[PDB]
Amino acid sequence: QFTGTGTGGDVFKVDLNEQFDRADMVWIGTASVLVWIMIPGVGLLYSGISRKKHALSLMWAALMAACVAAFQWFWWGYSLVFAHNGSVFLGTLQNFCLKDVLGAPSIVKTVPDILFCLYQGMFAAVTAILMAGAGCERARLGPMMVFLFIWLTVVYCPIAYWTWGGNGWLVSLGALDFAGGGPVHENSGFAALAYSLWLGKRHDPVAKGKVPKYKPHSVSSIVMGTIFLWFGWYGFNGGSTGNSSMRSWYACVNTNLAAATGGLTWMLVDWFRTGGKWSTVGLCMGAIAGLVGITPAAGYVPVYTSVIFGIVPAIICNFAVDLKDLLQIDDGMDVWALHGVGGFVGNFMTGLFAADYVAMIDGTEIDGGWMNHHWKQLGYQLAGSCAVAAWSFTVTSIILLAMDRIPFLRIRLHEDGTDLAQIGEYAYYADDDPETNPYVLEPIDDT
Amino acid sequence: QFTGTGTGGDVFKVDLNEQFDRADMVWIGTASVLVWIMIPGVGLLYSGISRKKHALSLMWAALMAACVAAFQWFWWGYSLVFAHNGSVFLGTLQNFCLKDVLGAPSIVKTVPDILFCLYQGMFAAVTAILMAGAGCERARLGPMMVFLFIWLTVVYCPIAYWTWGGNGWLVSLGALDFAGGGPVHENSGFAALAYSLWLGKRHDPVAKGKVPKYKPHSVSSIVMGTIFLWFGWYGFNGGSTGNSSMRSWYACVNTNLAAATGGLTWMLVDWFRTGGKWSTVGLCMGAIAGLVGITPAAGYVPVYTSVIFGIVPAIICNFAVDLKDLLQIDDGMDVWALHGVGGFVGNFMTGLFAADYVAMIDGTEIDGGWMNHHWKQLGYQLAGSCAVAAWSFTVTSIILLAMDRIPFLRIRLHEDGTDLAQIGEYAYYADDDPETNPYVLEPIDDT
Amino acid sequence: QFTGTGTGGDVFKVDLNEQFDRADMVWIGTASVLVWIMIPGVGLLYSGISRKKHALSLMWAALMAACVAAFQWFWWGYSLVFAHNGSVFLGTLQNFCLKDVLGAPSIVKTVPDILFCLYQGMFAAVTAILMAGAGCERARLGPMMVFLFIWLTVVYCPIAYWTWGGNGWLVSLGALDFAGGGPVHENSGFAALAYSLWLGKRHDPVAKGKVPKYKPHSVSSIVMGTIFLWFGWYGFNGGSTGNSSMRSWYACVNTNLAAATGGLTWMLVDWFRTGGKWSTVGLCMGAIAGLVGITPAAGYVPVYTSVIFGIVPAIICNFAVDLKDLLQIDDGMDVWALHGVGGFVGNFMTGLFAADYVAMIDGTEIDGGWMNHHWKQLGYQLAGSCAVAAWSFTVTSIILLAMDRIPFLRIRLHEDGTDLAQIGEYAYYADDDPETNPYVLEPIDDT
Ligand SMILES: CCCCCCCCCCO[C@@H]1O[C@@H](CO)[C@H](O[C@H]2O[C@@H](CO)[C@H](O)[C@H](O)[C@H]2O)[C@@H](O)[C@H]1O
Ligand SMILES: CCCCCCCCCCO[C@@H]1O[C@@H](CO)[C@H](O[C@H]2O[C@@H](CO)[C@H](O)[C@H](O)[C@H]2O)[C@@H](O)[C@H]1O
Ligand SMILES: CCCCCCCCCCO[C@@H]1O[C@@H](CO)[C@H](O[C@H]2O[C@@H](CO)[C@H](O)[C@H](O)[C@H]2O)[C@@H](O)[C@H]1O
């Protein structure tokens, strides 16, 4: 009388709630709310850090992303990731417009479909504002919204299915990704690098010669963003057990400690490299690097190793940021360095420190990693993170370039010398007051 | 040995907690905390949107409202709405100063009195800062606080009882109001219109001729407010089941989707009406309109209809805002257009799309609306929303006018030409710095 | 097969989760997240209130404190407070680096070790940013971080053990401290007074003669801080039951009401003392005073007495702030007046109003206070708050002075007249822009 398909049964004849522990559902409902406030967190963070005045306010853009992503998820995003009749590479349109999404056990069986929909939808939205922030410089809004809908559909949704889906080939292969380091962070990072390399401003003056590595538009914005992100990450990582067990709280302790050691580590590196300065921007980026690092690992690794997930990503991401000098590109490179590089490092290290007895805390069964002499685990992590990077860079490139050849879908004006025109363009962007301007400052052309 | 009255029994002889599912209580406790942060959310929103410099900071005023409303609720607000011995129009003073408020099942039987008190108290506080924001222009603080205490007592509390109370006549009549669209939004909106029409500044220059429809004091404030409100609304709507079932999470999905489609819809309307501009203020107002729209409906309607609750309120509220031109009044009209008009539209539409099988998800029994060929439901919604609008406008008018004839209770100086006096009044309000001024800039008169 | 020691048992043979109610764990997990956002709350509050421009941004410093405190807690802070093999004055290094912290019932038996670790760790972090804010004026960052690690280890951890530990002598003596008014507020306040008296700037011009009592750096910052603190305090106080019972929600109602009456009370006192001005800073400080006041009491006293916990601390703390005039010291005195004095008053009053039938709501057994003719309870409170004040002032003094005699550990330059040097020092601090400066403005000396 509980069917385990469609709606899960007839509400007029059964209590669909009897299939689930109530406390499990409450923790996952709460966690969903927490992940949501991470979305403006991303916006405040990349708005503040910018070494350039972005015409588009990313704090505002975070609300736009929340709107676009929620409609995409409802329309067919959810179905494409978490339908029960999927192949090994993709879901279906079976839950188009959330049809029959109710009380059947979700692919995470301790919660029903409708709760898993709510939870996982927040993950797609966080990824959308990361993507929007990566390609925001001189972006046209219309094209940006279209781009996000397309990118969530053909880049986020396939990768998410491989990672989390019923018959996802990475699931079947035995690759570990606790809280979606692959679909969210690694994914958005390498999509950001496609933006940088194809549409980013080349020979950029903020990224060339002896200019300061850190030159923030707004420190108070960076801090507010980091606050929202660290606060929300308890639901992001802690809710990825799908339950109310103590593995949830174990994963929260790991999240806190990786952030803390990441923050301190990056600020220490900067101290050595500057000859004794204390970096305010760097402490914040280090916390984000630890959070990203521990994401694929938080419910799999022992508590004292969570420190390594703060330390090692902070060091490597800190140096990765220097590649902006080498390439002389600024646009999009911060998101690649933190989420792309940090996601890769964290996914790799999970292969080293995953432990079957950490997973077993709530009955979850894994072979483990190098901790349990499971050497081959490292190979499973690499196949995951290489597949994710390859698909993300390639398909994001194809979308950017294809939209670039269509005049009314082009995301960024090509900027391909009238004295009067240059004076006007400068003043157009310089005089704008985002605080009081009721309208988006749309990129301006020769007409 | 569980009495079901007063305190519910003797703590020294029974565990009063045995009467309730623990997960139910945890979700409602959590939801209470969430609703609380909506209070500064309202303050930041209406502070930012203002086309005029308000002498009173509404962000600060939100904390004042939290103080006044919590004391009023404790004193007799709770008793007047949720006492167990009420008539059909009002409660009693039986729980004066929260006497014997403990472990008896509340009128929402899945939680005890003391938890329902906490939860529903947040609803009264949200309504108080909406009211304070509606009548803040040139308000005197002393009179404003008194006004709020009186207005919560004789306007909020009767309407809330009709909607939610043990023998409330709207409850008995079969009108649907899931999360209090009536007591909170519709109520505060039509009380706002009474302020506009009786005390609002007439022939206002920001609302007359060809002046810009949107001219915000602070965009970053609007965005921060919208963030807090959308975040908190998960508890506002999701906790209105009184339990931990999947109807709670179903209602959260509806809340997210209505906000998203409301945001996109209002920004699209503005795009047509401006000939291609992207409205930053409008995206935010559209999200608020959807949230308001879905409030009476969130746990009653099917997921794909939640889109309509974003779209239709966004369009109608957008045009309602133009009535400010027609009347040449600005003061108080934003709250009427969003909460008054949006609450009305959402209450009406609930009569159309309510479905007994959506309610049945957690065992709740309703005849449903037009979805279940229950045509008469639309008539029940209209009687609710007309009663609410009539009582709110009339009794708020009477309070405003009565306080206006008492010199030391008058809320706003009548402003009924010395050259020197006008220069001084202008400079008084212009020179004030809210960031650093330790005191409220009290309205200034000829002495 | 549940051992009740070390890890609590073998995860491969038992479900350690069977020992606990799931709803209990979910509420305490949620509460932990809430307490965390109180940390930037403290930072925003004391940044905004300052009558001086602090070279160190306290909003930023709150994230630093979160990093340092999380690492200290992991390293040995947790072990020193909540190890199961402690003496009567201190814990052990048994859980060094969180070794074997998992599934054994914690000293609060309704939650496991790993969840109690997470929860109580937030309390240590809140105390760390209070301490950092108290001694931030002209602080050198390196020394400040070292200082925090040392102070949490030898001041916070002993006092916390006495209050909360397995064999803590204050626990055994029967002193009541519901949510840690002793370890957090009283403690940090009297440590702040040691800073003021030993390192604070003497004959300070902002604290001398006829200068304004309130002269805030940023009102919007005070308000944002108060918002985060009041929001988080629901977890701070509500989670101190260790469970999901209605005593948790009872304690939340008490928290809300004490804040509200504290806010209104302080603003009323200021109104009398200024001859009719409305104090924006004072409403906020009054809310904080009530929150502090009700902290040792929230789950022990009857609801209508929670009003007294707002009123009496607001009055006394308001006058305590005047002692800054008497001493002509500003540095560190705000934290003493609010948390030191307010913690003392609230601890004292708990001895008066504690009621065994309030505790009994969830089965907790106490003799009660003067409500249950238990006169001796007042003596137990005094011994607690005198021990806490004595240990905090003395050992903080010794740490400050000892670091002051070591050139590279000195927290504040001694400031012990070149015309050119004075012009330069003035311009150094005046010209700094915290919004855009990528580095901490380190105190500057003659080289
Ligand atoms: C499910 C989510 C989907 C939401 C809706 C998506 C709609 C997007 C389609 C593109 O729309 C165009 O985008 C603007 C570019 O941003 C256009 O140009 C506007 O902006 C300038 C571009 O900078 C132009 O030069 C024009 O002056 C001005 O009309 C604007 O007219 C509009 O036609
Ligand atoms: C349970 C919640 C209730 C909380 C307490 C409510 C108390 C309110 C009563 C009214 O109080 C008056 O309000 C001020 C007006 O705002 C008065 O004028 C003050 O403000 C100016 C008005 O603009 C005046 O001209 C005077 O100079 C100045 O004394 C002030 O003196 C005070 O008498
Ligand atoms: C577990 C948490 C622990 C985290 C790490 C703690 C490390 C703290 C040790 C002290 O470090 C010193 O602190 C700076 C003082 O703040 C020093 O001077 C720096 O700052 C100026 C002091 O104002 C000096 O004059 C110098 O120019 C400049 O090098 C800096 O070099 C560094 O040696």
PDB file of N, CA and C in Angstrom, chain A residues 11-12 16-17 20 22-23 25-26 33 36-37 40 59-60 67 70 74 98 102-103 114 118 122 141 145 434-440 442, chain B residues 23-24 214 216 218-220 223-224 227 230-231 234 244-246 249-250 252-253 256-257 260 264 267 277-280 303 356-357 360-361:
ATOM      1  N   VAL A  11      -2.926   9.410  -0.570  1.00  0.00           N
ATOM      2  CA  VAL A  11      -3.009  10.144   0.697  1.00  0.00           C
ATOM      3  C   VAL A  11      -4.335   9.883   1.412  1.00  0.00           C
ATOM      4  N   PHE A  12      -5.380   9.600   0.651  1.00  0.00           N
ATOM      5  CA  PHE A  12      -6.678   9.308   1.241  1.00  0.00           C
ATOM      6  C   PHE A  12      -6.735   7.905   1.872  1.00  0.00           C
ATOM      7  N   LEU A  16       1.662   8.836   4.072  1.00  0.00           N
ATOM      8  CA  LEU A  16       2.966   8.740   3.412  1.00  0.00           C
ATOM      9  C   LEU A  16       4.115   9.093   4.359  1.00  0.00           C
ATOM     10  N   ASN A  17       3.814   9.857   5.406  1.00  0.00           N
ATOM     11  CA  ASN A  17       4.796  10.240   6.417  1.00  0.00           C
ATOM     12  C   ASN A  17       5.316   9.077   7.293  1.00  0.00           C
ATOM     13  N   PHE A  20       8.917   7.603   7.021  1.00  0.00           N
ATOM     14  CA  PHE A  20      10.120   8.367   7.363  1.00  0.00           C
ATOM     15  C   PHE A  20      10.182   8.723   8.836  1.00  0.00           C
ATOM     16  N   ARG A  22      10.620  11.440  11.532  1.00  0.00           N
ATOM     17  CA  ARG A  22      10.235  12.837  11.494  1.00  0.00           C
ATOM     18  C   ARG A  22      11.428  13.771  11.737  1.00  0.00           C
ATOM     19  N   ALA A  23      12.312  13.360  12.636  1.00  0.00           N
ATOM     20  CA  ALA A  23      13.481  14.138  12.957  1.00  0.00           C
ATOM     21  C   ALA A  23      14.416  14.235  11.752  1.00  0.00           C
ATOM     22  N   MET A  25      13.454  14.417   8.671  1.00  0.00           N
ATOM     23  CA  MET A  25      12.848  15.389   7.781  1.00  0.00           C
ATOM     24  C   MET A  25      13.047  16.818   8.296  1.00  0.00           C
ATOM     25  N   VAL A  26      12.985  16.998   9.607  1.00  0.00           N
ATOM     26  CA  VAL A  26      13.099  18.321  10.168  1.00  0.00           C
ATOM     27  C   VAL A  26      14.519  18.862   9.957  1.00  0.00           C
ATOM     28  N   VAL A  33      16.833  25.603   4.222  1.00  0.00           N
ATOM     29  CA  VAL A  33      16.730  27.018   4.512  1.00  0.00           C
ATOM     30  C   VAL A  33      18.127  27.641   4.654  1.00  0.00           C
ATOM     31  N   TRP A  36      19.955  28.153   1.361  1.00  0.00           N
ATOM     32  CA  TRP A  36      19.395  29.243   0.589  1.00  0.00           C
ATOM     33  C   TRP A  36      20.122  30.581   0.838  1.00  0.00           C
ATOM     34  N   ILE A  37      20.466  30.878   2.088  1.00  0.00           N
ATOM     35  CA  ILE A  37      21.107  32.143   2.395  1.00  0.00           C
ATOM     36  C   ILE A  37      22.575  32.163   1.936  1.00  0.00           C
ATOM     37  N   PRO A  40      22.869  34.674  -1.532  1.00  0.00           N
ATOM     38  CA  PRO A  40      23.390  36.038  -1.438  1.00  0.00           C
ATOM     39  C   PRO A  40      24.795  36.103  -0.846  1.00  0.00           C
ATOM     40  N   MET A  59      25.361  41.395  -5.357  1.00  0.00           N
ATOM     41  CA  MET A  59      24.424  41.241  -4.252  1.00  0.00           C
ATOM     42  C   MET A  59      22.979  41.200  -4.760  1.00  0.00           C
ATOM     43  N   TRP A  60      22.666  42.111  -5.674  1.00  0.00           N
ATOM     44  CA  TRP A  60      21.366  42.131  -6.310  1.00  0.00           C
ATOM     45  C   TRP A  60      21.210  40.904  -7.220  1.00  0.00           C
ATOM     46  N   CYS A  67      15.838  33.359  -8.442  1.00  0.00           N
ATOM     47  CA  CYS A  67      14.585  33.303  -9.178  1.00  0.00           C
ATOM     48  C   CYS A  67      14.709  32.389 -10.378  1.00  0.00           C
ATOM     49  N   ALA A  70      15.274  28.600  -9.308  1.00  0.00           N
ATOM     50  CA  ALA A  70      14.092  27.951  -8.745  1.00  0.00           C
ATOM     51  C   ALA A  70      13.107  27.582  -9.840  1.00  0.00           C
ATOM     52  N   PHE A  74      12.204  23.556 -10.954  1.00  0.00           N
ATOM     53  CA  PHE A  74      10.800  23.181 -11.078  1.00  0.00           C
ATOM     54  C   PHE A  74      10.461  22.666 -12.477  1.00  0.00           C
ATOM     55  N   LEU A  98       7.498  19.220 -11.827  1.00  0.00           N
ATOM     56  CA  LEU A  98       7.375  18.569 -10.519  1.00  0.00           C
ATOM     57  C   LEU A  98       6.122  17.691 -10.415  1.00  0.00           C
ATOM     58  N   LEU A 102       6.123  13.813  -4.636  1.00  0.00           N
ATOM     59  CA  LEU A 102       5.480  13.884  -3.335  1.00  0.00           C
ATOM     60  C   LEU A 102       6.147  12.954  -2.336  1.00  0.00           C
ATOM     61  N   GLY A 103       5.521  11.804  -2.083  1.00  0.00           N
ATOM     62  CA  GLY A 103       5.829  11.020  -0.905  1.00  0.00           C
ATOM     63  C   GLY A 103       6.568   9.709  -1.078  1.00  0.00           C
ATOM     64  N   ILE A 114       9.530  15.286  -2.281  1.00  0.00           N
ATOM     65  CA  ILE A 114       9.245  16.706  -2.180  1.00  0.00           C
ATOM     66  C   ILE A 114      10.245  17.440  -1.260  1.00  0.00           C
ATOM     67  N   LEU A 118      13.296  20.172  -2.562  1.00  0.00           N
ATOM     68  CA  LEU A 118      13.566  21.430  -1.890  1.00  0.00           C
ATOM     69  C   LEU A 118      15.049  21.607  -1.530  1.00  0.00           C
ATOM     70  N   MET A 122      18.388  24.093  -3.714  1.00  0.00           N
ATOM     71  CA  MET A 122      19.265  25.114  -3.157  1.00  0.00           C
ATOM     72  C   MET A 122      20.698  24.978  -3.675  1.00  0.00           C
ATOM     73  N   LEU A 141      22.116  41.682 -19.078  1.00  0.00           N
ATOM     74  CA  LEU A 141      21.277  40.919 -18.156  1.00  0.00           C
ATOM     75  C   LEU A 141      20.361  39.889 -18.825  1.00  0.00           C
ATOM     76  N   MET A 145      20.545  35.758 -18.061  1.00  0.00           N
ATOM     77  CA  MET A 145      19.477  34.950 -17.508  1.00  0.00           C
ATOM     78  C   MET A 145      19.220  33.728 -18.377  1.00  0.00           C
ATOM     79  N   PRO A 434      25.104  52.735  -7.965  1.00  0.00           N
ATOM     80  CA  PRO A 434      24.358  51.496  -7.705  1.00  0.00           C
ATOM     81  C   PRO A 434      23.401  51.569  -6.500  1.00  0.00           C
ATOM     82  N   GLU A 435      23.755  52.371  -5.497  1.00  0.00           N
ATOM     83  CA  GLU A 435      22.916  52.638  -4.327  1.00  0.00           C
ATOM     84  C   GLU A 435      21.558  53.269  -4.644  1.00  0.00           C
ATOM     85  N   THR A 436      21.483  54.093  -5.682  1.00  0.00           N
ATOM     86  CA  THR A 436      20.287  54.901  -5.886  1.00  0.00           C
ATOM     87  C   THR A 436      19.710  54.736  -7.281  1.00  0.00           C
ATOM     88  N   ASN A 437      20.460  54.086  -8.167  1.00  0.00           N
ATOM     89  CA  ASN A 437      19.992  53.865  -9.532  1.00  0.00           C
ATOM     90  C   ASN A 437      18.952  52.745  -9.548  1.00  0.00           C
ATOM     91  N   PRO A 438      17.722  53.070  -9.968  1.00  0.00           N
ATOM     92  CA  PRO A 438      16.618  52.109 -10.008  1.00  0.00           C
ATOM     93  C   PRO A 438      16.767  51.048 -11.106  1.00  0.00           C
ATOM     94  N   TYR A 439      17.706  51.237 -12.029  1.00  0.00           N
ATOM     95  CA  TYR A 439      17.843  50.331 -13.163  1.00  0.00           C
ATOM     96  C   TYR A 439      19.252  49.765 -13.290  1.00  0.00           C
ATOM     97  N   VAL A 440      19.350  48.554 -13.835  1.00  0.00           N
ATOM     98  CA  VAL A 440      20.646  47.955 -14.128  1.00  0.00           C
ATOM     99  C   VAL A 440      21.384  48.817 -15.154  1.00  0.00           C
ATOM    100  N   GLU A 442      23.076  48.875 -18.022  1.00  0.00           N
ATOM    101  CA  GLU A 442      23.338  47.998 -19.150  1.00  0.00           C
ATOM    102  C   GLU A 442      24.555  48.455 -19.936  1.00  0.00           C
TER     103      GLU A 442
ATOM    104  N   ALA B  23       9.606  15.924  17.118  1.00  0.00           N
ATOM    105  CA  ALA B  23      10.018  16.500  15.863  1.00  0.00           C
ATOM    106  C   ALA B  23       9.069  17.622  15.444  1.00  0.00           C
ATOM    107  N   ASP B  24       7.784  17.472  15.759  1.00  0.00           N
ATOM    108  CA  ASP B  24       6.814  18.535  15.500  1.00  0.00           C
ATOM    109  C   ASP B  24       7.230  19.818  16.215  1.00  0.00           C
ATOM    110  N   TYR B 214      10.164  54.688  -9.595  1.00  0.00           N
ATOM    111  CA  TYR B 214      11.147  54.150  -8.668  1.00  0.00           C
ATOM    112  C   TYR B 214      12.296  55.129  -8.487  1.00  0.00           C
ATOM    113  N   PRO B 216      14.877  54.999  -5.306  1.00  0.00           N
ATOM    114  CA  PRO B 216      15.189  54.396  -4.007  1.00  0.00           C
ATOM    115  C   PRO B 216      16.253  55.112  -3.194  1.00  0.00           C
ATOM    116  N   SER B 218      18.025  53.594  -0.992  1.00  0.00           N
ATOM    117  CA  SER B 218      19.111  52.643  -0.786  1.00  0.00           C
ATOM    118  C   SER B 218      18.809  51.260  -1.378  1.00  0.00           C
ATOM    119  N   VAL B 219      19.485  50.907  -2.463  1.00  0.00           N
ATOM    120  CA  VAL B 219      19.214  49.632  -3.116  1.00  0.00           C
ATOM    121  C   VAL B 219      19.768  48.474  -2.278  1.00  0.00           C
ATOM    122  N   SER B 220      20.929  48.679  -1.668  1.00  0.00           N
ATOM    123  CA  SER B 220      21.546  47.633  -0.875  1.00  0.00           C
ATOM    124  C   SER B 220      20.668  47.266   0.332  1.00  0.00           C
ATOM    125  N   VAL B 223      17.675  45.024  -0.886  1.00  0.00           N
ATOM    126  CA  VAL B 223      18.170  43.687  -1.165  1.00  0.00           C
ATOM    127  C   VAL B 223      18.405  42.899   0.121  1.00  0.00           C
ATOM    128  N   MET B 224      18.994  43.550   1.113  1.00  0.00           N
ATOM    129  CA  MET B 224      19.210  42.931   2.403  1.00  0.00           C
ATOM    130  C   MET B 224      17.870  42.573   3.065  1.00  0.00           C
ATOM    131  N   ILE B 227      16.261  39.663   1.348  1.00  0.00           N
ATOM    132  CA  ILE B 227      16.989  38.458   1.698  1.00  0.00           C
ATOM    133  C   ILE B 227      16.468  37.888   3.020  1.00  0.00           C
ATOM    134  N   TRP B 230      12.743  36.533   2.589  1.00  0.00           N
ATOM    135  CA  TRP B 230      12.613  35.305   1.827  1.00  0.00           C
ATOM    136  C   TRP B 230      13.136  34.120   2.671  1.00  0.00           C
ATOM    137  N   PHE B 231      14.291  34.310   3.308  1.00  0.00           N
ATOM    138  CA  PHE B 231      14.857  33.392   4.288  1.00  0.00           C
ATOM    139  C   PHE B 231      13.880  33.027   5.435  1.00  0.00           C
ATOM    140  N   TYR B 234      10.274  30.815   5.056  1.00  0.00           N
ATOM    141  CA  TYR B 234      10.240  29.365   5.113  1.00  0.00           C
ATOM    142  C   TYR B 234       9.623  28.897   6.436  1.00  0.00           C
ATOM    143  N   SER B 244       5.754  18.368  11.546  1.00  0.00           N
ATOM    144  CA  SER B 244       6.964  17.957  10.848  1.00  0.00           C
ATOM    145  C   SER B 244       6.697  17.094   9.618  1.00  0.00           C
ATOM    146  N   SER B 245       5.456  17.079   9.138  1.00  0.00           N
ATOM    147  CA  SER B 245       5.091  16.257   7.982  1.00  0.00           C
ATOM    148  C   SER B 245       5.668  16.815   6.689  1.00  0.00           C
ATOM    149  N   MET B 246       5.482  16.081   5.597  1.00  0.00           N
ATOM    150  CA  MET B 246       5.939  16.551   4.298  1.00  0.00           C
ATOM    151  C   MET B 246       5.021  17.642   3.699  1.00  0.00           C
ATOM    152  N   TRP B 249       7.126  20.749   3.957  1.00  0.00           N
ATOM    153  CA  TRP B 249       8.163  20.919   2.941  1.00  0.00           C
ATOM    154  C   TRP B 249       7.542  21.241   1.584  1.00  0.00           C
ATOM    155  N   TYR B 250       6.368  20.668   1.331  1.00  0.00           N
ATOM    156  CA  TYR B 250       5.532  20.984   0.167  1.00  0.00           C
ATOM    157  C   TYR B 250       5.204  22.477   0.135  1.00  0.00           C
ATOM    158  N   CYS B 252       6.973  24.825   1.547  1.00  0.00           N
ATOM    159  CA  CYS B 252       8.225  25.531   1.361  1.00  0.00           C
ATOM    160  C   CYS B 252       8.602  25.631  -0.116  1.00  0.00           C
ATOM    161  N   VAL B 253       8.390  24.540  -0.846  1.00  0.00           N
ATOM    162  CA  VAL B 253       8.579  24.514  -2.287  1.00  0.00           C
ATOM    163  C   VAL B 253       7.657  25.543  -2.965  1.00  0.00           C
ATOM    164  N   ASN B 256       9.121  29.197  -2.211  1.00  0.00           N
ATOM    165  CA  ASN B 256      10.240  29.433  -3.095  1.00  0.00           C
ATOM    166  C   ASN B 256       9.800  29.752  -4.530  1.00  0.00           C
ATOM    167  N   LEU B 257       8.910  28.936  -5.086  1.00  0.00           N
ATOM    168  CA  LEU B 257       8.507  29.102  -6.482  1.00  0.00           C
ATOM    169  C   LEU B 257       7.656  30.357  -6.749  1.00  0.00           C
ATOM    170  N   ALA B 260      10.033  33.359  -6.717  1.00  0.00           N
ATOM    171  CA  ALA B 260      10.852  33.359  -7.927  1.00  0.00           C
ATOM    172  C   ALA B 260      10.099  33.873  -9.150  1.00  0.00           C
ATOM    173  N   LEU B 264      10.602  37.554 -11.246  1.00  0.00           N
ATOM    174  CA  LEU B 264      10.758  37.599 -12.686  1.00  0.00           C
ATOM    175  C   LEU B 264       9.599  38.310 -13.374  1.00  0.00           C
ATOM    176  N   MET B 267       9.678  42.249 -12.914  1.00  0.00           N
ATOM    177  CA  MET B 267      10.791  42.809 -13.671  1.00  0.00           C
ATOM    178  C   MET B 267      10.498  42.794 -15.174  1.00  0.00           C
ATOM    179  N   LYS B 277      14.259  48.690 -20.002  1.00  0.00           N
ATOM    180  CA  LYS B 277      15.114  48.817 -18.816  1.00  0.00           C
ATOM    181  C   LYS B 277      14.928  47.630 -17.873  1.00  0.00           C
ATOM    182  N   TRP B 278      15.975  47.277 -17.134  1.00  0.00           N
ATOM    183  CA  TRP B 278      15.872  46.220 -16.140  1.00  0.00           C
ATOM    184  C   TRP B 278      15.772  46.840 -14.739  1.00  0.00           C
ATOM    185  N   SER B 279      14.645  46.600 -14.081  1.00  0.00           N
ATOM    186  CA  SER B 279      14.306  47.264 -12.829  1.00  0.00           C
ATOM    187  C   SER B 279      14.827  46.498 -11.604  1.00  0.00           C
ATOM    188  N   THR B 280      15.765  47.100 -10.869  1.00  0.00           N
ATOM    189  CA  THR B 280      16.338  46.435  -9.696  1.00  0.00           C
ATOM    190  C   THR B 280      15.373  46.441  -8.512  1.00  0.00           C
ATOM    191  N   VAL B 303       1.631  22.172  -6.528  1.00  0.00           N
ATOM    192  CA  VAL B 303       2.892  22.866  -6.775  1.00  0.00           C
ATOM    193  C   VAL B 303       2.925  23.713  -8.050  1.00  0.00           C
ATOM    194  N   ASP B 356      -8.264  19.349  -1.787  1.00  0.00           N
ATOM    195  CA  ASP B 356      -8.391  18.529  -0.575  1.00  0.00           C
ATOM    196  C   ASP B 356      -7.280  17.492  -0.457  1.00  0.00           C
ATOM    197  N   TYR B 357      -6.774  17.003  -1.582  1.00  0.00           N
ATOM    198  CA  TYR B 357      -5.679  16.040  -1.537  1.00  0.00           C
ATOM    199  C   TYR B 357      -4.310  16.659  -1.231  1.00  0.00           C
ATOM    200  N   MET B 360      -4.733  16.860   2.473  1.00  0.00           N
ATOM    201  CA  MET B 360      -4.742  15.503   3.037  1.00  0.00           C
ATOM    202  C   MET B 360      -3.324  14.911   3.231  1.00  0.00           C
ATOM    203  N   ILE B 361      -2.306  15.541   2.639  1.00  0.00           N
ATOM    204  CA  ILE B 361      -0.917  15.085   2.763  1.00  0.00           C
ATOM    205  C   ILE B 361      -0.496  14.787   4.215  1.00  0.00           C
TER     206      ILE B 361
END
